[PDB]
Write an enzyme that holds these catalytic residues in place. Sequence first.
Site, PDB file in Angstrom:
ATOM      1  N   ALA A  46       0.605  -1.917  -1.538  1.00 41.50           N
ATOM      2  CA  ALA A  46      -0.665  -2.297  -2.160  1.00 41.50           C
ATOM      3  C   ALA A  46      -1.237  -3.594  -1.606  1.00 41.50           C
ATOM      4  O   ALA A  46      -2.394  -3.630  -1.189  1.00 41.50           O
ATOM      5  CB  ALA A  46      -0.508  -2.392  -3.666  1.00 41.50           C
ATOM      6  N   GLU A  47      -0.430  -4.654  -1.579  1.00 40.48           N
ATOM      7  CA  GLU A  47      -0.923  -5.932  -1.075  1.00 40.48           C
ATOM      8  C   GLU A  47      -1.267  -5.879   0.404  1.00 40.48           C
ATOM      9  O   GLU A  47      -2.320  -6.378   0.811  1.00 40.48           O
ATOM     10  CB  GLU A  47       0.061  -7.076  -1.364  1.00 40.48           C
ATOM     11  N   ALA A  48      -0.402  -5.253   1.203  1.00 34.89           N
ATOM     12  CA  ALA A  48      -0.638  -5.135   2.643  1.00 34.89           C
ATOM     13  C   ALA A  48      -1.911  -4.330   2.920  1.00 34.89           C
ATOM     14  O   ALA A  48      -2.609  -4.582   3.902  1.00 34.89           O
ATOM     15  CB  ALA A  48       0.560  -4.502   3.334  1.00 34.89           C
TER      16      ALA A  48
END
Length: 254
Positions: free
Chosen positions: A176-178
């Site tokens: 998600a963050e990447a």
Amino acid sequence: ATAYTLNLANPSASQYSSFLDQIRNNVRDTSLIYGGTDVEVIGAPSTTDKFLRLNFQGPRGTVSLGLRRENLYVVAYLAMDNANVNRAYYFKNQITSAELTALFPEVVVANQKQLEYGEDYQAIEKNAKITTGDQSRKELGLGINLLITMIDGVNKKVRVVKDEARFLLIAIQMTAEAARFRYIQNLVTKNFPNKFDSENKVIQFQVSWSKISTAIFGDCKNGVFNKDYDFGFGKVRQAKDLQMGLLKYLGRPK
């Protein structure tokens, strides 16, 4: 419903990047252009296709992640226990039994367990029992090899909340963050496949996703902010310097 698989048996930088692009391309609305930038924007919430399944395929088994398509928030995860029985663990406020059955069909209702803690980083971090530094996720580091090690802690093992929490912290950031931040993706591929140290800038990006999205959506013209912005790591005037991968849905541009 839709599922994408990351092959951790034979990992390559290109495979990881393509994997992230599949996530971005799945949830984006190509008709949405924020602040005159070419960055992908998540589309409006769907009532028919609410979740996305991510499979982490390893040599000894596969662990899966469930994410909300409307905002990429984690809703649940699947892993086999010590008896090779598939079990699903979910956040109550994120998904229901019926939806979980559709997301992870290999898990029977009886084997669906509601997690005791919240889906926010603070709650998960406290259960991770990190004892050094500020005791936050930053202290675990990042990287493909780290993700592999974390999966080993939940794959075909008796559930230990400490190991489960640590896996979630790394899995959420590596997916998600990447997807949201290319800076994070670039760090992973630059150090591929090694484990490496995280940074304050990594955390600063994560906590300011909404702020960054709002800034580009309503205070940016042709990639240039109307005023200087600082999200913790210095003044930014151009959206390109943020290396965004995916913006939060805030409606259509006015």
